[PDB]
């Protein structure tokens, strides 16, 4: 279902924005990061084996951005701020991916 | 059996990762590799219906979740607390003894 892919991918995008936009000292950070990683794992596990999705810009861009977020947290733990230039890049990839997503791309 | 093969590999990575000293330069890679194997195992078998009735699956799932929850809360260099690490390793042995017998 394409509508379901749009709903699920929008939710993940919102979680990335929520997690990345918290204050670096914020106490909810560890919880936010944990929820994001659970959302990311579910999204990947649901959609990565769907072959044709690799042809969607929305999928490639979200998959790449989630990997950028995941790689940072698995290296440094949940309260390490993502480097500012990567954070900017990730949030920009979220915007480009969401613009494709809601056009059915 | 594919499930036995995959679960043995995960057990082995848990044992390898938990046994490393905190000075080991491979710890970061080892935790990452374990996280990846753990994700692939759960994604592959949590969907399978029959397996939640298997002791090996429940015990592995539980122990991977204990490993996961620790490393999502701390960096890869933070050791799992000693008493939990020992319990995890013991559940690995229990799970493997059931796994090898088809349970």
Residue numbers in the entry:
A (entry chain B): 2 to 106
B (entry chain A): 4 to 106
What's the publication's text?
A large number of auxiliary proteins, including Psb27, have been shown to be involved in the assembly and/or the repair cycle of PSII. In addition to its role in PSII assembly, Psb27 was found to play a role in PSII repair as well. An Arabidopsis mutant lacking AtPsb27 was deficient in recovery of PSII activity after photoinhibition, suggesting that AtPsb27 is required for the efficient repair of photodamaged PSII. The two Psb27 isoforms from higher plants do not contain lipobox sequences and N-terminal cysteines, and they are not membrane-anchored lipoproteins.
